[PDB]
Ligand binder design. Structure first.
Ligand SMILES: *SC[C@H](NC(=O)CC[C@H](N)C(=O)O)C(=O)NCC(=O)O
Ligand SMILES: *SC[C@H](NC(=O)CC[C@H](N)C(=O)O)C(=O)NCC(=O)O
Lengths: 236, 236
């Protein structure tokens, strides 16, 4: 493959998807951290007009990441980037070679993106009822096989969900959010035990994956979430 | 590939996506029309728990589509099915083999799914401002090359959008919707001329594609939409 520069941010779960994929592929790449509170003026016009992470500059000459060349192809959207790494590295295991398994992989990601992630942000940012979060977690849990990862062998499906389960845990166990203070620890426990014991086992296995743990700085993310969302209950 | 049975509906743009993909691949398959006004009792427990079209039953023994076998693999979600057909038919052209080109294909689809389709349904069903529909259309148009289809050769990107542009046109030119009566023909003209001339040429090219025209029944869709959505406007 041609050279890869990844524009990313430790706080951002969509960006961690891209980091996990590159780690699974053992890809050589140059990282560049974007401060989302203080973005470089060059980032939107030169790299990503949406002004978000993650993004990749692919190819072109060897340049510093803050001096991108217009000759590199600019790419964005986390789920596009994960399948891009999978297509660059066909022996990475990010996607099965099997058509049915690939479809089941993407079907799982659709459950994550359409049900679980919106239900989490509704609960976390707005204090919506936990009802939809349980419904979405039960649905995602029902797609899991008895053992292993989303379609057995680790794949893009696990990459898609792991950064969000990790930051849900960080938020809940620290009571960060707009939901009633004190419910957080109860909800994470409920999502990982009893009726949700399979989901709890799934989360354990995700968090133990080397490509996850090597791209997750739990202390940094916890501190960044606490600072950013401290005022959810108190701001007028 | 193994045997393919497609559960579909003429009215449904999501299902037309799959039909276009199968036509581009010259795939052998058995269609079955799902009565969306009176869905068969067996459809949700035996084929698709979400009770939506499209769905595919893949493989297993030869069965009547109204008696699906538990041995066939059941698949759903239109964009999953389109990539499934792509993966089954490597000479179909639905996806390029080139990693960058595949990424740009999926990136176009993300703009269609996240901006254009929600803005259309908001205008049609919710009487939202036309502003967001033009904004979303301008973004999609900005991704088009100077000539040709979304990434050059006809691909999953065009498959994703064509059924929705076709039904937006039918709705607008026949004044079906919650927007003020008489605005529709002017909005479709606006979306296909002037600042949207490129998008107008794209729509013309899409609707002339054989896989699109052979899977679109404009008389049926116009009559079906007129009956279904006759009450979006007050009688007073
Ligand atoms: S997590 C930080 C934010 N990134 C995204 O939301 C990416 C979403 C895309 N759809 C994707 O890659 O999947 C971010 O960069 N926000 C910009 C800001 O100004 O906060
Ligand atoms: S167009 C007919 C409806 N299908 C869908 O909405 C499919 C959406 C999926 N996300 C997809 O395949 O992309 C439909 O079947 N409606 C029936 C119902 O009861 O909702």
């Amino acid at each position: 493959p041609e050279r890869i520069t990844l524009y990313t941010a430790k706080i951002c779960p969509f960006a961690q998807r891209a980091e996990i994929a590159l780690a699974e592929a053992k890809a050589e790449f140059t990282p560049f951290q974007i401060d989302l509170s203080n973005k470089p003026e060059w980032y939107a016009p030169k790299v990503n007009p949406a002004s978000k992470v993650p993004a990749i500059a692919y190819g072109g000459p060897e340049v510093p990441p803050d001096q991108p060349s217009p000759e590199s192809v600019k790419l964005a959207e986390s789920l596009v980037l994960v399948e891009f790494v999978a297509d660059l590295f066909p022996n990475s295991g990010i996607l099965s070679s099997d058509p049915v398994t690939r479809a089941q992989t993407r079907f799982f990601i659709e459950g994550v993106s359409s049900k679980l992630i919106p239900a989490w942000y509704a609960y976390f940012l707005r204090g919506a009822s936990v009802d939809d979060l349980y419904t979405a977690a039960e649905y995602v849990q029902s797609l899991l096989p008895a053992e292993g990862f989303a379609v057995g062998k680790f794949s893009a499906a696990d990459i898609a969900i792991a950064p969000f389960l990790a930051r849900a845990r960080v938020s809940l166990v620290n009571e960060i959010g707009k939901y009633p203070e004190g419910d957080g620890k109860k909800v994470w426990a409920a999502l990982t035990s009893g009726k949700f014991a399979r989901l709890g086992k799934y989360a354990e296995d995700l968090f133990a994956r080397e490509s996850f743990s090597s791209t997750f700085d739990e202390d940094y993310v916890t501190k960044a979430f606490s600072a950013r969302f401290a005022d959810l209950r108190s701001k007028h």
